[PDB]
Design a protein around this motif. Structure first.
Motif, PDB file in Angstrom:
ATOM      1  N   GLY A 153       0.801  -1.218   0.000  1.00  0.00           N
ATOM      2  CA  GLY A 153       0.000   0.000   0.000  1.00  0.00           C
ATOM      3  C   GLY A 153       0.830   1.261   0.000  1.00  0.00           C
ATOM      4  N   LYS A 154       2.073   1.158  -0.425  1.00  0.00           N
ATOM      5  CA  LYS A 154       2.995   2.292  -0.487  1.00  0.00           C
ATOM      6  C   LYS A 154       2.933   3.151   0.752  1.00  0.00           C
ATOM      7  N   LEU A 155       3.151   2.527   1.898  1.00  0.00           N
ATOM      8  CA  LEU A 155       3.274   3.264   3.155  1.00  0.00           C
ATOM      9  C   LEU A 155       4.193   4.454   2.965  1.00  0.00           C
ATOM     10  N   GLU A 156       5.435   4.177   2.617  1.00  0.00           N
ATOM     11  CA  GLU A 156       6.436   5.173   2.243  1.00  0.00           C
ATOM     12  C   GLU A 156       7.125   5.814   3.425  1.00  0.00           C
ATOM     13  N   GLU A 157       6.512   5.800   4.590  1.00  0.00           N
ATOM     14  CA  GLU A 157       7.176   6.207   5.824  1.00  0.00           C
ATOM     15  C   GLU A 157       7.653   4.984   6.580  1.00  0.00           C
ATOM     16  N   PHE A 158       7.799   3.878   5.870  1.00  0.00           N
ATOM     17  CA  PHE A 158       8.105   2.587   6.487  1.00  0.00           C
ATOM     18  C   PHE A 158       8.425   1.543   5.447  1.00  0.00           C
ATOM     19  N   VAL A 159       8.857   1.966   4.276  1.00  0.00           N
ATOM     20  CA  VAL A 159       9.039   1.063   3.136  1.00  0.00           C
ATOM     21  C   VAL A 159      10.452   1.172   2.611  1.00  0.00           C
ATOM     22  N   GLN A 160      10.654   0.880   1.341  1.00  0.00           N
ATOM     23  CA  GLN A 160      11.983   0.827   0.732  1.00  0.00           C
ATOM     24  C   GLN A 160      11.885   0.414  -0.722  1.00  0.00           C
ATOM     25  N   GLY A 161      12.566   1.127  -1.604  1.00  0.00           N
ATOM     26  CA  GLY A 161      12.592   0.756  -3.015  1.00  0.00           C
ATOM     27  C   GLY A 161      13.338   1.756  -3.862  1.00  0.00           C
ATOM     28  N   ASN A 162      14.575   2.022  -3.491  1.00  0.00           N
ATOM     29  CA  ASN A 162      15.457   2.876  -4.282  1.00  0.00           C
ATOM     30  C   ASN A 162      16.831   2.261  -4.407  1.00  0.00           C
TER      31      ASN A 162
END
Length: 47
Positions: free
Chosen positions: A4-13
């Motif tokens: 769900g693309k949290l984004e404040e708890f994710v990773q993908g770069n």
């Protein structure tokens, strides 16, 4: 909420946590979630 693309708890770069320095082909395989995508890019990153 597996993603769900949290984004404040994710990773993908990559640039952030691999470049400006040096890491390993391993772990990149894990973000691309497929071998094909990872050796056909890491090729350029190396020699």
């Amino acid at each position: 909420y597996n993603s769900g693309k949290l984004e404040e708890f994710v990773q993908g770069n990559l640039e952030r946590e691999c470049m400006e320095e040096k890491c390993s082909f391993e772990e990149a395989r894990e973000v691309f979630e497929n071998t094909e995508r990872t050796t056909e890019f890491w090729k350029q990153y190396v020699d």
